[PDB]
Amino acid sequence: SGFRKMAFPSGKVEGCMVQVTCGTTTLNGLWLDDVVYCPRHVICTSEDMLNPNYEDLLIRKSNHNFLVQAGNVQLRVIGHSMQNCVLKLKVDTANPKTPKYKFVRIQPGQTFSVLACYNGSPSGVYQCAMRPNFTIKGSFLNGSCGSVGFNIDYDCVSFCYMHHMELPTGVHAGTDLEGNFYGPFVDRQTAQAAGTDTTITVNVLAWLYAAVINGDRWFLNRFTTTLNDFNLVAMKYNYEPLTQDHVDILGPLSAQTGIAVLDMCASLKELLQNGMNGRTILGSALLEDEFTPFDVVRQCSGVT
Amino acid sequence: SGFRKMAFPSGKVEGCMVQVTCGTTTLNGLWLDDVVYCPRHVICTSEDMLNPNYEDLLIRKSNHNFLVQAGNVQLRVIGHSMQNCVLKLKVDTANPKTPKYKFVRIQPGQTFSVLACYNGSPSGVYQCAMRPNFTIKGSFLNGSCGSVGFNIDYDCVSFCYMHHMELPTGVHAGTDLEGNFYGPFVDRQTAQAAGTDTTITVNVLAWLYAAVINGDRWFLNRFTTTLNDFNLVAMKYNYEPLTQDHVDILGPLSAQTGIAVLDMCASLKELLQNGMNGRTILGSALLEDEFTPFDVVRQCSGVT
Ligand SMILES: Cc1ccncc1NC(=O)CNC(=O)Cc1cccnc1
């Protein structure tokens, strides 16, 4: 028993982190096979970031201008290309620690682990969710760009995020491993304000199920609701609409606990309207939304 | 910017996890050099756990009764001994992935990362704190015993915890790597109730400093207090007393933010007396106490 915000074991990703330097800018790179992936803004100075023309800035760079270091050994760069907002640096050595991997583009509400790195060295691992406004609330300082987000399915690492930007509001923006930003963000130091950070309803419900499985049941009430009635309350509280697809995804948690999804929705509706009244659920005084239904099933069943 | 509950990168510890089976009981072991450390209750059946005589139960076990598997390869056990509540199984092969390591016994209030494992396989990593009542609030299911807690200082892993028990209240108990339980707990399936789970005051203050560094400043007030006045309020709210040693440890955070430790104590005192009023600090509606002052400095400076 017990339920924790849990990241994937990071070892497989640690074996992929490298340091990438271009001129005076140093950030992180991801070494998979004989390619090093990194944010294309490695070629910019902080001044260039105000209004960069990446294609133009890249013409002034050759293979030998990208310095790649894995541990304390230098990798030889034999090619470089820009794919969307990432640079792919072909090196002459395949990463011997390359795990089985995939590049996936996740949907808002999906969670993942981030291995925060500085100078190609891992500092820590934490669990994030892609917010409904396509930002992530991470912990990233100067030099953390190129740190990646991932999920692991047994031995296959699905890379879903690469860190690029910190918006003026202190929230984070980045790309998938094909270099496409999540949301409308751009790799330019300019006014980029985020949209509404709504709560991931399906994740809150999955976490309420985890709370019941772990003995925290005070919030269970004698009511039920419908998707339409629930969604009227959800809109009012800046919660994402719940669809029949979300109800389907919560099916196994409903079956395991004997609590119908719409009954849990009614419990959630009362929590929104009445508040927590100084009480806690799984040690939290707010409704947690960074556990997907799959994460709850995995953690509650011990998936390795 | 941003502040997250962050665990250490777990790779170094993943390379140490093995599966240990004795009869019908399977749990995790920690392989360092040519020794595998595991909870001595691996020799018990669930029935033995009610009132086990470990020395007696151990007489019926030989080296060949301990099955140790690292990945999918079996290790040969050439010796076994009991040290307090852990078994040390000498194997004929030194773990080739043994990191630089130390065995440390931590004090209450200290944080660490847990690599939750099942059948010697890592499932996830999360950050814990040794509670003032010597329990930890982890996420551990059947088969997770032998999972370890650790801190990393650059390349040296300091192992501080090994999982042994889940108390009837769903909180966790375990030992250091010398097999001595933290607190008054025993490896027996019997009534063991935990003491008061007080809040780690020095950790809450360090986290309030992290909140200021990251822009969350609404809670800063126009007051100051003294250690004695603060401690009268702390006692009332089940917060640990704050000592001059804690004030000293918070010195660098006070210097970085220009906020005197006693002023932050006064802010905390008002948060206790007035409540959060529906507001959040670093995305939390309660005062977080599982970040030490050292963790705040590390995360806010990017220590790798
Ligand atoms: C400041 C920050 C913090 C965390 N994560 C990300 C960031 N960075 C940004 O949003 C914007 N980039 C910079 O200001 C620094 C820079 C210079 C030259 C080339 N690339 C980047």
Ligand SMILES: Cc1ccncc1NC(=O)CNC(=O)Cc1cccnc1
């Ligand atoms: C039940 C549990 C869950 C999480 N962490 C720990 C535990 N385990 C316990 O507190 C007590 N041990 C058992 O009930 C299981 C067992 C059988 C035979 C030999 N050792 C252990």
